[PDB]
C-alpha cells in the first residue's frame, strides 16, 4: 500500500476492501434496530457505565447510546441525528432503507458489475419514487380526528398501547390550542415536566403551567385561587455597585444608617409591587404570583409574606415566554411603568411537594396558548419512555398540520412504491436496469420486518400482500395481528408525509456515496 | 561512565544517489493516492481525524491535509496543493499528479550521468513556453453572459460530489460570486471568504437549498415581548456594549452620607437610558450589537418596539453591514443618518430544527449572501461546502481573467505538440530533457481512461494523432464515455489561472526537489 | 473518539502479510529487483571496482564477481531470490557472465513498470517479450565471427583467455593467461571430455602474482613423519586402508592361554607387519600414501627399507593422485603389487613460504593434472585471484562444447538492440511496444561498462549506433582512455563465450517473466 509508505502506522483499505468494511457494518446496525420496529417491536435495556437504566427503543436514543467504534456506524448516526431533531419519528425506518441499499448492491457491484452504475439507477428510481409519493398522499383538511390516527400510530411504536390512548389525548388536544388561523406552532410553548406522583398512565395535560419551584417561605400561601400573575425579570435580591466603592461610618450609630440606606433602593422595588395589589381594588381575596426568574433576598420575602404575596424565585429563560401568553400578561424589566394591564390572571394557583421538592401549578386560564403535558412516571427510566414518546409524537401531530395531506401507514406506501418502480423499470434505457431492481427491493423491507416481528413468515406475507395490490387499486398493507393484507387508510394507520420525503432523500444521497468509497484510512498521528 | 568524543550527536547523514532517487519515491508515493480522485468518474475518499470527526471526500486538497507524513521531501508535495487551494479553487489535485510525473521522467536522466541542474535548466525552457502555448489556444469570454458562466462552472464541478445537482449549483455559485462583487473606490475586488458565507444546516433536502439574498445568524430574539417579523426593519449595527460597566481606571467611591449608595445605583440605570435614548432619535427597528445588552436596555427597546439581537459574532457584523449597507458604530451618541441600514427587506426569526434562526433577506441591493445549506447530515454538507468553495473561486477567476482552457486532455496534449516541434532547433545535450517535459503532460489524459476503464494504448495513438494537424487541436478525453469527443461539443472549459498555476506550481516543485542532494535530520531548535 | 479500520473479508492471518494487485505486488517486485541491478552495476566490466563483503560468519570477501557476492548477501526478498537463482544457473551452466543476469533482467524489469504504467498489462510484456526472446536467439549465430578451433596450443589460447581474465584482474592480464594456458591444454583428453575438476589451486601465502606458477601434479600442504623426503625413481603405491596392520571389524580380542602364547606374541606383531613392508620394498616403491593412520611399527620399517610414506587424511584428494600417477587405490593391506603402481618424476619436500608442502612433480610426462600454485600478499587476494582462474578453466569448458565466439565489449548487444528494434517496427500489432523495449535493455549493458569507466554514457551510447551501419558488426568500446573514439573488437580481440551469450539472454528473459507472472504475494511469519 502507499499511505503504508509514508506513514507506518496508518492502516488502509483498498477497493475491494473498503466496500466489505461498510457493508457489513450496515447489516450490524440493521440486525440490531430491525427487532424494534412497529408495534410489535422488542424493547432495549441500555446501560451506561454509570449504571442508570435507559429503556427505550428509538432508532436515535438506540445508535447514540451503544458501544459501537466504527466510521460506518458514525456516518448513519449523523443521518440519524437530523432525522429525529426536524419531523420526529421516521428514525428506526431510515437505518434499515440504508441497510438494504447496501445489501441488495453487494449482489450486483461483487457480479462484476461497478459501483457507479448501481448509483445512477438509485437516482433514476428515487425521482420516480417522489413523484409517486405526492399521488398517494391524502389530504383530511387537518380534522382532530385524524390527528387522533397520525398520533396513535406514533405512540403506539413506543409504548405498550395501554398508555396510547392516555397520551393520544395529551398529545392532540395540547397541539390544537396554541396557534389559530394557518400559523407555524412553536414547539418551546409545551413545558415537559416529571413528576413521581400516582403512575406512569396518570399523565395528564395541564392547560396552564407547571413550574418545578415552590415557594421559598414557609408564611406564603399554598393554594391562591383568582390570582394575578406579575412576570418580572428584575433582581429583587441585594446587588452590588459596578464600581467597588465600599462604605465609610465614623460612629456605631452611623453604621446602621446606611444598613437601612443600601437597602432603600431594594425596598422602593419591593413598594412598587405592594402598591400595585392595592389598585387592582383590594377589598377581597386578591392573590398576587410573582414568577421572578431572578433571585430574591429573603429581606423582601418577608416583606412580601406580611402583604399577602406569593413570591417565587430562580425560573427559567423560556418562562417569560410561556407564562406571557398563558396569563396574558406583560413580561417587565423595569418597574418605571407599572400597570394593572401588565397583570395576569389564573383561577387557580396551587403548590404541592413530592419529597422536598415543591411545583407550583398555574391552572384555569382562558386562551392560554401554552400548555404542560404532565408527566408522572413512578421510575427513573419510566420517565424517558413517556419523554421520547411525547416529543415524537408532538412533532408526528405538527407535521400533519403544516402539510395538508396525511401519508398512509405501514406497508400502503412502501408497497405501492416498489411496484410502481417495476413498471418504469424498462424505461431508464441502458446500464442502470439493476440499480432500479436494488431500490425497489430495498423498500420493500418495511413489510419484511413488521412481518417478521409480529412472528408472522416474511416471505409468505409479502406475495399476499403484493397481490392484493396487484390485483386492485387500494394501496393495501401489513396487518400486525392477523397478517392478512389489510388497507391502512381505513383502519386509522396513518404516517407523516415528510417522514416518507425525506426517508427516500437521505438514505438515497448517503447510499449514493457509501458505494463510491474506497480508500479507507486512518491518518494524522 | 566515559562518553565518546563525537560530532554532531544523534543526527543522521545521506547523499548521493539514496536522496536523488529517495525524494522520487517520495513524490510517486503520494501521485498514487490521489490518482483516482482526477476525472469526473472519481469516487469518494473516507478519512480519519484524531479529533473524532470524518472526512469522506474526493478533492485533492482535502484528502492531503488529513495526511501526516514522515518524510521531508513528502511534507512538500503536501503544501504544494495548500497553495493551488488558495490561488484558485479546482486546481490542486491535477498539479500532484503532473508533478509526480515529471519527477518520474526525471529519475531517468539521473541514471543517465546528467547533472540535475541540466534538468532544471530544461525544465525553465519548457515552462517559459507552456504559459505561451496556452495563451494562443485560448478564447475570450462573455462576462455579462448568464449562460456562458454557467458552462464554465459546470465544468469544475462535473469532477466533484454535487453533479447530480448541477442544474442548483451552478445558479447558486454563480448568484453568490456577482452579489459579492463590491467596489468603493477605484478597485475591484471579490471577497468570497468573508462576506460568502456557506452556514448549513442538518435536515430537508439538498433541492431545497438555495443562496439567500442577504445573511443569516444563529441567534433568537432577546426578549419574547420584541417582534419576530418586520417587513422594512432600519437595522442598526453597535460595536460596543449597552450596559454598564467597569471602566479601565482605578475608579473607588467612598461613600459617607446615606443618599450616596442609592444615587449611584440610580445613575447606572440612568447612563442606560441616555445611550438607549441616543439610538432611538433616528427610529430604528432592529438594534444588533456584538456585546452584552443588559435587562434595563431591553426595558426601553420593549416599550419602543425594537427587536434586539444580543451576541453577534464580529465576522457576521461586517458581513450584514454591506448586505443591509449599515455602518458598524461603536459610539451610541454618535450615531447618524446614514449609520442606518435601510434598504433591508423581510426580516423573520424562522426555526430550523428546535433552533431559532434570525433571517435577513430580500435585501435590494447587498454585497454580502449567504448560502443556506441544508441536506441529510454534517458529514455531506461538509462536502458540499467545500465543492461550492471551489465552485465560486473558479467564477471568480474569470471575472479577474475572461480566458477559456479547453479541458479534458486537449489542453495537456495541445502543448505536447507544442514543445515537441519547438524540441527540433534544440541541437544540444538539454534536448532529451526538454522532450520528457512534453510526454509529463501526457498523464493527464492517461488518468482520465484509466478511472472510466479505458484503454490506454488504443485512445493514447489515436489522440496523439489529431494534435498532428494544425485544424482542430482542441480534441480531449471524454471522461463519461470513453471516447474522443470535441471540446467544442461537450462544454468541457478550463480558465487560464486554473491551467497556469497548475503548470507553474509542477515545474517549480520538480525544480525544488532535484537540487536537494543532502538531508540531515536530528537536530533541535530554539 | 478516533475510531479505526479493522479486517474486511479474509484478514485470517496470525502474523502474516498479504499482497495483491499491480501497485502492492507487482510493481514492488520491480522495485527490489531494481535495487540488485544497481547494485552490482559498479562491479561490472574490466574496469569494475571490488566489494568488501562479510557475511553472518565475519569474514571477508572481496571480488567483482557477482557470482559470489549475491552467495554472501542474505537477502529476503523473495522476487530478488528469482535473479539470483538465475544467476546461481549461469555459474552452473557456463560459469562466466552471471553478472549478465543482474544486468539484463535487471533492466528488463525495470523497463517493464514503463510499460505497465503506461499501457498494456502483464499478458502482454510477457508474450511480448517472448517473441524478442527467440529472435534474439537467431542473431546469435549470425553475429559470430571467430571461432577458437585453429591451432589449440598455449599461443593462441592465451589471447581468448584474455577476455575472463581482463574483467576481474585488469592489471595482471597478461600474466594470468599464461598460466591459465599451461594448465588447462596440459589437461587435454585427445578430443575427449574436458574435466575443470582436474585443476586445482594451491593458495601459498608469500611474495607477489610474478611469483605464481603451474606445476604438473599435485601439491599437499602435509608432512613425511621419515627421513626419506628426497625421492627421484617415484614409484608411488596408493592405500585407502590405514597403514597400521590388519584388524578384525566385530570386535577384537586377543586370548592367551600359555606363557608361550604371551611372550611370542609381541616378537610375532613385529615379524608379521616386517613382512609386509618389506613386501612392497621388494616391488621397488619408494612412496607409500595411506589414507588412514601409521602405527609406530610402520613407521620402523619404513625408514628401514627407506620408503617415503605420505599421510591424506582427506578421501577426496586420494582419489586426484591416483589419476596423477596413474595408480589404483588398494582397499586391502600391502600385497605384491602387480600392475596398479603409480609412476612420477619427482616427489619431493619444499619450504615455500614458510609451508613445507610435498610437489608430485612430473618431468617428462607432464599432462595427467595440472595445479595452479598462486602466491600472494593476502589471504583475501589469493581468494579474488582464484575466482579469476576458476572462471578462465569455466571458459575453456564453454570452447569445448562449442567452439564460436561472439565480439563483447559491447559489440555483441548493440548489434542485438539493433535487429529486435527492426522486428519490433515491422510489428502490426499492440505487442510491438515490449519488442522495441527487450532491444533497449541489450542498450543499458554498454551503458554499464562506460560509468564505470568515468564516460559520459550519452556520447559512448550514440557513437554506437552511428558505426552500426548495417555492415560493420563489430565496433564495440575502448575503455583505456577518455575521449573513446571507440575501434574494432576483432583487431583488439576482445570476444567471448557465445555460449555464454545464449544462455545469459535465455535465463535473465525467463528470469524477468517469472516476477511478471507473479501477481498476488502470500508470505508466512518469518523466524
Ligand atoms: N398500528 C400500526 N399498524 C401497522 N403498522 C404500524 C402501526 N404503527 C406503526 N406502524 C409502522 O411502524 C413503522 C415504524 O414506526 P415508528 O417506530 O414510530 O417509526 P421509526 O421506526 O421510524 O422510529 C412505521 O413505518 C409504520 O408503518
Ligand atoms: N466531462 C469531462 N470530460 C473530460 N474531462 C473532464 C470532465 N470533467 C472534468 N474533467 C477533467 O477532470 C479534471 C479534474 O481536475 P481537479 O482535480 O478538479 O483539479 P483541482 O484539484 O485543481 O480542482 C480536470 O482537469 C478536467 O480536465
Ligand atoms: N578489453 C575490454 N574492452 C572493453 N570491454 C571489455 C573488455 N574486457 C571485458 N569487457 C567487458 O566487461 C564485461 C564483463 O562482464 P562479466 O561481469 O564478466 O559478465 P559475467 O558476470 O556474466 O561473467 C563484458 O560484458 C565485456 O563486454
Ligand atoms: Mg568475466
Redesign the interface.
Given at each position: 500500500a502507499?499511505?503504508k509508505?509514508?506513514?507506518p502506522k496508518?492502516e488502509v483499505a483498498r477497493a475491494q476492501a473498503?466496500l466489505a468494511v461498510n457493508i457489513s457494518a450496515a447489516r450490524g446496525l440493521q440486525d440490531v434496530l430491525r427487532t424494534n420496529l412497529g408495534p410489535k417491536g422488542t424493547m432495549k435495556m441500555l446501560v451506561s457505565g454509570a449504571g442508570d437504566i435507559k429503556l427505550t427503543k428509538d432508532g436515535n436514543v438506540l445508535l447514540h447510546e451503544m458501544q459501537i467504534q466504527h466510521?460506518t456506524a458514525?456516518?448513519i448516526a449523523?443521518?440519524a441525528?437530523?432525522q429525529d431533531?426536524?419531523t420526529g419519528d421516521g428514525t428506526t425506518s431510515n437505518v434499515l432503507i440504508i441497510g438494504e441499499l447496501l445489501k441488495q448492491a453487494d449482489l450486483y457491484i461483487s457480479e462484476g458489475l461497478?459501483?457507479?452504475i448501481i448509483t445512477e439507477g438509485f437516482?433514476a428510481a428515487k425521482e420516480k419514487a417522489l413523484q409517486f409519493l405526492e399521488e398517494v398522499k391524502v389530504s383530511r383538511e387537518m380534522d382532530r380526528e385524524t390527528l387522533i390516527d397520525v398520533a396513535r400510530t406514533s405512540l403506539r411504536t413506543k409504548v405498550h398501547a395501554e398508555l396510547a390512548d392516555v397520551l393520544t389525548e395529551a398529545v392532540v388536544d395540547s397541539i390544537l390550542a396554541i396557534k389559530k388561523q394557518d400559523e407555524?406552532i412553536?414547539?418551546?410553548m409545551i413545558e415537559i415536566m416529571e413528576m413521581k406522583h400516582k403512575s406512569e398512565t396518570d399523565t395528564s395535560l395541564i392547560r396552564g403551567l407547571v413550574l418545578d419551584h415552590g415557594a421559598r417561605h414557609p408564611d406564603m400561601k399554598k393554594r391562591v385561587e383568582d390570582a394575578y400573575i406579575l412576570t418580572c425579570?428584575?433582581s429583587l435580591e441585594y446587588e452590588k455597585?459596578?464600581?467597588?466603592?465600599?462604605?465609610?461610618?465614623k460612629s456605631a450609630e452611623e453604621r446602621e444608617?446606611?444598613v437601612?440606606?443600601?437597602r432603600?433602593?431594594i425596598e422602593d422595588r419591593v413598594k412598587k409591587i405592594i402598591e400595585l395589589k392595592r389598585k387592582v381594588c383590594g377589598d377581597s381575596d386578591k392573590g398576587f404570583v410573582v414568577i421572578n426568574q431572578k433571585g430574591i433576598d429573603p429581606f423582601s420575602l418577608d416583606a412580601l409574606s406580611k402583604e399577602g404575596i406569593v413570591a417565587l424565585r430562580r425560573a427559567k429563560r423560556r418562562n417569560?415566554?410561556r407564562l406571557?401568553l398563558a396569563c396574558g400578561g406583560?413580561?417587565?424589566?423595569?418597574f418605571?411603568?407599572l400597570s394593572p394591564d401588565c397583570l395576569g390572571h389564573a383561577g387557580l394557583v396551587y403548590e404541592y411537594t413530592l419529597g422536598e421538592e415543591k411545583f407550583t401549578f398555574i391552572e384555569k386560564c382562558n386562551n392560554p396558548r401554552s400548555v404542560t403535558l404532565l408527566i408522572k412516571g413512578p421510575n427513573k427510566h419510566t420517565l424517558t419512555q413517556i419523554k421520547d414518546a411525547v416529543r415524537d409524537g408532538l412533532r408526528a401531530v405538527k407535521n400533519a398540520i403544516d402539510d395538508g395531506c396525511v401519508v398512509p401507514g405501514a406497508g400502503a406506501v412502501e408497497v405501492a412504491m416498489a411496484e410502481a418502480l417495476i413498471k418504469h423499470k424498462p424505461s431508464v434505457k441502458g446500464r442502470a436496469q439493476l440499480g432500479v431492481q436494488a431500490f425497489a427491493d430495498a423498500l420493500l423491507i418495511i413489510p419484511k420486518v413488521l412481518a417478521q416481528n409480529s412472528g408472522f413468515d416474511l416471505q409468505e406475507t409479502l406475495v399476499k400482500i403484493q397481490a392484493e395490490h396487484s390485483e386492485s387499486g387500494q394501496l393495501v398493507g401489513v396487518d400486525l395481528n392477523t397478517g392478512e393484507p389489510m388497507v391502512a387508510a381505513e383502519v386509522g394507520v396513518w404516517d407523516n408525509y415528510c417522514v416518507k420525503?425525506?426517508l427516500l432523500?437521505?438514505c438515497t444521497?448517503?447510499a449514493?456515496?457509501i458505494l463510491?468509497?474506497?480508500?479507507?484510512?486512518?491518518?494524522?498521528? | 561512565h566515559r562518553p565518546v568524543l563525537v560530532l554532531s550527536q544523534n543526527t543522521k547523514r545521506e547523499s548521493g544517489?539514496k536522496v536523488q532517487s529517495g525524494n522520487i519515491?517520495?513524490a510517486k508515493?503520494?501521485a498514487?493516492?490521489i490518482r483516482?480522485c482526477l476525472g469526473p468518474?472519481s469516487?469518494?475518499?473516507?478519512?480519519?481525524?484524531?479529533?473524532?470527526g470524518?472526512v469522506?471526500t474526493n478533492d485533492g486538497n482535502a484528502i492531503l491535509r488529513?495526511?501526516?507524513?514522515?518524510?521531508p521531501a513528502?511534507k512538500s508535495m503536501i503544501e504544494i496543493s495548500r497553495t493551488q487551494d488558495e490561488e484558485v479553487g479546482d486546481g490542486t489535485t491535477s498539479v500532484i499528479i503532473l508533478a509526480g510525473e515529471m519527477l518520474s521522467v526525471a529519475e531517468h536522466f539521473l541514471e543517465?550521468?546528467?547533472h540535475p541542474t541540466v534538468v532544471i535548466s530544461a525544465y525553465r525552457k519548457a515552462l517559459d513556453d507552456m504559459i505561451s502555448t496556452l495563451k494562443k489556444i485560448s478564447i475570450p469570454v462573455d462576462i455579462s453572459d448568464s449562460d456562458m458562466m454557467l458552462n464554465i462552472i459546470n465544468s469544475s464541478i462535473t469532477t466533484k460530489?454535487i453533479s447530480?445537482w448541477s442544474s442548483l449549483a451552478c445558479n447558486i455559485a454563480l448568484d453568490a460570486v456577482k452579489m459579492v462583487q463590491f467596489e468603493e473606490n477605484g478597485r475591484k475586488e471579490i471577497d468570497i471568504k468573508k462576506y460568502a458565507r456557506v452556514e448549513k444546516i442538518?435536515?430537508?433536502?439538498?433541492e431545497d437549498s438555495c443562496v439567500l439574498r442577504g445573511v443569516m445568524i444563529n441567534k433568537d430574539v432577546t426578549?419574547?415581548?420584541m417582534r419576530r417579523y418586520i417587513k422594512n426593519p432600519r437595522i442598526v449595527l453597535l460595536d460596543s456594549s449597552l450596559e454598564?460597566?467597569?471602566?479601565e481606571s482605578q475608579?473607588?467611591?467612598?461613600?459617607?452620607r446615606?443618599?450616596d449608595?442609592?444615587r449611584?445605583?440610580?445613575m447606572?440605570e440612568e447612563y442606560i437610558q441616555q445611550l438607549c435614548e441616543d439610538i432611538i432619535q433616528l427610529k430604528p427597528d432592529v438594534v444588533i450589537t456584538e456585546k452584552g445588552i443588559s435587562?434595563?436596555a431591553?426595558?426601553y427597546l420593549?416599550?419602543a418596539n425594537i427587536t434586539a439581537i444580543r451576541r453577534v459574532r464580529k465576522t457576521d457584523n461586517n458581513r450584514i453591514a454591506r448586505a443591509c449597507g449599515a455602518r458598524i458604530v461603536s459610539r451610541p451618541e454618535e450615531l447618524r443618518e446614514d449609520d442606518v441600514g435601510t434598504g433591508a427587506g423581510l426580516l423573520e426569526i424562522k426555526?430550523?430544527?428546535?433552533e431559532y434562526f434570525t433571517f435577513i433577506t430580500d435585501c435590494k441591493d447587498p454585497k454580502a449572501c449567504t448560502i443556506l445549506l441544508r441536506?441529510?447530515?454534517?458529514?455531506?454538507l461538509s462536502?458540499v461546502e467545500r465543492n461550492l468553495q471551489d465552485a465560486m473561486q473558479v467564477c471568480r477567476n474569470v471575472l479577474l481573467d475572461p480566458q477559456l482552457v479547453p479541458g479534458g486532455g486537449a489542453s495537456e496534449m495541445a502543448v505536447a505538440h507544442a514543445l515537441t516541434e519547438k524540441s527540433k532547433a534544440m541541437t544540444g545535450?538539454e534536448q532529451?530533457p526538454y522532450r520528457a517535459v512534453a510526454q509529463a503532460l501526457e498523464v493527464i489524459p492517461?488518468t482520465l481512461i484509466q478511472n472510466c476503464?479505458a484503454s490506454?494504448?488504443?485512445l493514447?495513438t489515436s489522440l496523439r494523432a489529431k494534435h498532428t494537424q494544425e485544424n482542430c487541436e482542441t480534441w480531449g478525453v471524454n471522461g463519461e464515455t470513453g471516447t474522443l469527443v470535441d471540446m467544442k461539443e461537450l462544454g468541457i472549459w478550463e480558465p487560464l489561472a486554473v491551467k497556469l498555476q497548475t503548470y507553474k506550481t509542477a515545474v517549480e516543485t520538480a525544480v525544488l526537489l532535484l537540487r536537494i542532494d543532502d538531508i540531515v535530520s536530528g537536530h533541535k531548535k530554539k | 473518539?478516533?475510531?479505526?479500520?479493522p479486517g474486511f473479508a479474509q484478514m485470517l492471518k496470525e502474523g502474516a502479510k498479504h499482497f495483491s494487485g499491480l501497485?502492492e505486488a507487482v510493481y514492488r517486485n520491480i522495485?527490489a529487483c531494481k535495487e540488485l541491478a544497481?547494485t552490482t552495476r559498479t562491479a561490472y566490466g574490466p574496469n569494475g571496482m571490488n566489494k568488501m563483503v562479510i557475511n553472518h560468519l565475519e569474514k571477508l570477501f572481496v571480488t567483482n564477481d557477482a557470482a559470489t557476492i549475491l552467495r554472501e548477501l542474505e537477502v529476503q526478498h523473495p522476487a530478488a531470490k528469482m535473479i539470483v537463482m538465475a544467476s546461481h544457473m549461469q555459474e552452473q551452466e557456463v560459469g562466466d557472465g552471471t553478472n549478465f543476469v543482474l544486468v539484463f533482467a535487471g533492466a528488463l524489469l525495470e523497463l517493464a513498470e514503463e510499460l505497465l504504467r503506461?499501457?498494456?498489462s502483464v499478458s502482454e510484456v510477457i508474450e511480448g517479450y517472448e517473441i524478442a526472446c527467440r529472435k534474439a536467439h537467431e542473431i546469435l549465430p549470425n553475429l559470430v565471427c571467430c571461432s577458437a578451433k585453429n591451432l589449440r596450443d598455449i599461443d593462441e589460447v592465451s589471447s581468448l583467455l584474455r577476455t575472463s581474465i581482463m574483467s576481474k584482474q585488469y592489471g595482471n592480464e597478461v600474466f594470468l593467461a599464461k598460466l591459465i594456458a599451461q594448465a588447462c591444454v596440459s589437461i587435454f583428453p585427445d578430443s575427449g571430455h574436458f574435466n575443470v575438476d582436474n585443476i586445482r589451486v594451491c593458495k601459498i601465502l608469500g611474495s607477489g602474482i610474478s611469483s605464481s606458477s603451474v606445476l604438473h601434479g599435485m601439491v599437499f600442504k602435509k608432512e613425511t613423519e621419515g627421513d626419506v623426503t628426497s625421492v627421484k625413481d617415484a614409484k608411488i603405491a596408493v592405500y585407502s586402508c590405514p597403514f597400521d596392520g590388519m584388524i578384525t571389524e566385530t570386535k577384537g580380542t586377543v586370548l592367551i592361554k600359555t606363557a608361550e602364547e604371551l611372550m611370542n606374541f609381541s616378537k610375532g606383531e613385529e615379524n608379521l607387519m616386517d613382512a609386509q613392508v618389506k613386501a612392497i620394498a621388494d616391488t621397488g616403491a619408494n612412496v607409500v600414501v595411506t589414507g588412514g593412520k601409521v602405527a609406530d611399527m610402520a613407521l620402523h620399517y619404513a625408514n628401514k627399507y627407506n620408503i617415503m610414506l605420505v599421510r591424506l587424511n582427506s578421501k577426496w584428494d586420494l582419489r586426484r593422485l591416483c589419476k596423477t600417477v596413474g595408480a589404483t587405490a588398494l582397499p586391502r593391506l600391502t600385497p605384491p603389487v602387480l600392475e596398479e603402481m603409480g609412476h612420477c618424476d619427482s616427489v619431493y619436500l619444499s619450504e615455500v613460504g614458510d609451508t613445507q608442502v610435498v610437489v608430485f612433480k612430473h618431468e617428462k610426462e607432464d599432462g595427467a593434472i595440472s595445479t595452479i600454485v598462486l602466491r600472494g600478499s593476502t589471504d583475501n587476494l589469493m581468494d579474488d585471484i582464484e575466482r579469476a582462474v576458476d572462471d578462465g578453466v569455466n571458459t575453456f569448458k564453454v570452447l569445448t562444447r562449442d567452439k564460436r565466439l561472439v565480439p563483447g565489449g559491447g559489440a555483441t548487444e548493440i548489434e542485438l538492440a539493433k535487429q529486435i528494434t527492426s522486428y519490433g517496427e515491422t510489428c502490426p500489432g499492440?505487442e510491438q511496444?515490449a519488442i522495441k523495449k527487450f532491444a533497449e535493455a541489450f542498450e543499458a549493458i554498454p551503458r554499464a561498462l562506460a560509468?564505470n569507466s568515468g564516460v559520459?554514457?550519452?556520447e559512448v551510447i550514440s557513437k554506437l549506433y552511428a558505426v552500426h551501419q548495417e555492415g560493420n558488426k563489430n565496433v564495440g568500446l575502448d575503455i583505456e582512455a577518455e575521449v573513446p573514439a571507440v575501434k574494432d573488437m576483432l583487431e583488439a580481440g576482445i570476444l567471448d563465450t557465445y555460449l555464454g551469450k545464449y544462455w545469459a539472454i535465455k535465463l535473465a528473459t525467463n528470469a524477468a517473466v517469472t516476477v511478471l507472472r507473479v501477481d498476488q504475494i502470500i508470505m508466512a511469519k518469518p523466524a
Open positions: 502507499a499511505v509508505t509514508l506513514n496508518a473498503a466510521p458514525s456516518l449523523k443521518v441525528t437530523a431533531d426536524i461497478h459501483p457507479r437516482e407555524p412553536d414547539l418551546f425579570n428584575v455597585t459596578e464600581v467597588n466603592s465600599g462604605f465609610f461610618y444608617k446606611l437601612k440606606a443600601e432603600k433602593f417569560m415566554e406571557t406583560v413580561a417587565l424589566n423595569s418605571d411603568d420525503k425525506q432523500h437521505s444521497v448517503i449514493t456515496n463510491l468509497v474506497d480508500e479507507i484510512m486512518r491518518a494524522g498521528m | 544517489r519515491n517520495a508515493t503520494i498514487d493516492i483516482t468518474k469516487m469518494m475518499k473516507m478519512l480519519l481525524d484524531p479529533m473524532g470524518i469522506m488529513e495526511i501526516q507524513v514522515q518524510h513528502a543517465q550521468q546528467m460530489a447530480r442538518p435536515g430537508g433536502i439538498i426578549h419574547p415581548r454598564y460597566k467597569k471602566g475608579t473607588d467611591i467612598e461613600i459617607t446615606e443618599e449608595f442609592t449611584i445605583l440610580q447606572e435587562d434595563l431591553q426595558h420593549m416599550r426555526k430550523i430544527g428546535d441536506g441529510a447530515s454534517k458529514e455531506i462536502e545535450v532529451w492517461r476503464g490506454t494504448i488504443r493514447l | 473518539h478516533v475510531p479505526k479500520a501497485e522495485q544497481q503506461i499501457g498494456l499492440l511496444y560509468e559520459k554514457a550519452n
